[PDB]
Structures are given as C-alpha cells and as structure tokens.
Amino acid sequence: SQPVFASPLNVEKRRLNEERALMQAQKANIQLPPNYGDMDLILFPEGSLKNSNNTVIPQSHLKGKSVALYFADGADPKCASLLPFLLNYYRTMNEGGANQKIEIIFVSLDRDREAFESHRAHMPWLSIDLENPLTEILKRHFRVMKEYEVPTYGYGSRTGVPSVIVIGSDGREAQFLPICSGLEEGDRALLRWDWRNTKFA
C-alpha cells in the first residue's frame, strides 16, 4: 500500500498474497483480503542484482544494510553533477566501518545499451540492467520520471531524475532524500541518509 497503491509492485503484491490466503482458506477464522502488515514479498529475484564484474550476487547479502535505489541517467546533467558526490558518500561510509554499512542499487533511465555501459564502468556499487522489466516496474512504484510520458494514476511527479531513495524490507518508503524535491536541496542531501531505522531486515 506504500508509497502508492497504483504500482506494478503492489498489484502483484495484492495478487500473490491473496491466493495464498485462499490456500490457507480452503485448507482450514482467516480474514480476506489479508492485511498490509501480513503481506510479505521478495523484491529482487535471484537473477536481478548484478555487481561490478557482472556476476550473480544473492539477495541474502542485503541483511544489516541501508539499501537505496538510485534513479539516474548518464546523459542527464543533474545526474552528472550529483554522481561524484554520491561516489564520495558511498566510499566514506563503507571503509568508515568494520562492516560494510550502506549500499546503493543502481537503477537507470538510459537511452540504450552503450549508454548504460558508459554509466556503469565507473560505478562501484550494485546495479540492475535495463532490459529486465524490474527497472520499469520500480520507477512507477516510486513515482519517478523525467516528465510525463506514461500516465500516472491520478498521481503527481514525486521526484525528478536523479533521486537516491532509501527503501524498506517490503518496498515501503523509508525516508526521503530531497536532491530535487519540495526542499530541492541539491548536492548535500546525502547527509540526511541515516542508517538506524532504515535497515533492510
């Protein structure tokens, strides 16, 4: 149900949780439909998350982390200015601790294949690739776009590209980083990234 109700994530959520609530229903005082707190998900499949040298990394690596989706674009000149600042903050928090602390999944809005390659050879953190429809369903789930191409379902425009945003375990919105937002506080908003209640349990 969070952050929106009309998203490809939450429509698959309210589908999948509902027939397995039916599986417990015909097997048996259960209530239909199941609650939002009772629904659980896998956000990223087995073959989704790819690291720098292009080998499979399991989802199970993400426990005890502050994981964040970073909507971005190589040709976008806002993103080219915020890119080394996120490089600084990612670096100084990893070896600023005995255990690796923060983590960014790179989710992109590039034009084509060669555009993502030029925007990936300089990235240390994980990434998701464009032809996988996980990128398309995630940007509607977080209401992120350049301008109005696809019709939102009565919604506005929450962010402009780029916007790094910390996520929850069940896809909930944890806490907002206003790079360009109502606050619009650019080039420093990574300082607001706390890592205490934003844990991917």
Binding site: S1, P3, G37, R172
Partner: peptide, 8 residues
C-alpha cells in the same frame, strides 16, 4: 500521506 505504524 498515510504513514507506517510505529513499532509497539
């Protein structure tokens, strides 16, 4: 917006 429940 409708906010998440705090932990009891």
């Amino acid at each position: 917006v409708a906010k998440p429940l705090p932990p009891p």
